[PDB]
Design a protein around this ligand. Structure first.
Ligand SMILES: [Cl-]
Ligand code: NA
Ligand SMILES: [Ru+3]
Ligand SMILES: [Ru+3]
Ligand SMILES: [Ru+3]
Ligand SMILES: [Ru+3]
Ligand SMILES: [Ru+3]
Ligand SMILES: [Ru+3]
Ligand SMILES: [Ru+3]
Length: 129
């Protein structure tokens, strides 16, 4: 599924990301925009052989199992395929674990490079939330 900007903002709020770990909803929408352009089916292979999955491009190196990332962990205890669903539950629940693990949203390199320190509230401007 490709979410609309406000559609995803609303969904993320429903799923408990609105100010999760002190990150305002706009941060999460911004991160999704640049990680996946709001497309739940996004995948991207990394140079180390791991793969990023879903709306928040969660990496098989640490967070999910895809059966083809030798030496990897599955710290969210999910198949990476769960992260491609039209329903964002699995992605959100795993993202909560990720953002709580020490580095906050710096875990998402596109968030650090494209969202951090910007007016992220712009990403939810106009949306019925
Ligand atoms: Cl933080
Ligand atoms: Na893994
Ligand atoms: Ru939902
Ligand atoms: Ru809010
Ligand atoms: Ru709110
Ligand atoms: Ru990545
Ligand atoms: Ru950990
Ligand atoms: Ru931990
Ligand atoms: Ru503003």
């Amino acid at each position: 599924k490709v979410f609309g900007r406000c559609e995803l903002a609303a969904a993320m709020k429903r799923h408990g990301l609105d100010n999760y770990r002190g990150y305002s909803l706009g941060n999460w929408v911004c991160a999704a925009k640049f990680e996946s352009n709001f497309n739940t089916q996004a995948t991207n292979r990394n140079t180390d052989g791991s793969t990023d999955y879903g709306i928040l491009q969660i990496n098989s190196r640490w967070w999910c199992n895809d059966g083809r990332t030798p030496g990897s962990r599955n710290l969210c205890n999910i198949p990476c395929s769960a992260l491609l669903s039209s329903d964002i539950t699995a992605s959100v629940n795993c993202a909560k674990k990720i953002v709580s693990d020490g580095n906050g949203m710096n875990a998402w390199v596109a968030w650090r490079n494209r969202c951090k320190g910007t007016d992220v509230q712009a990403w939810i401007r106009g949306c019925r939330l």
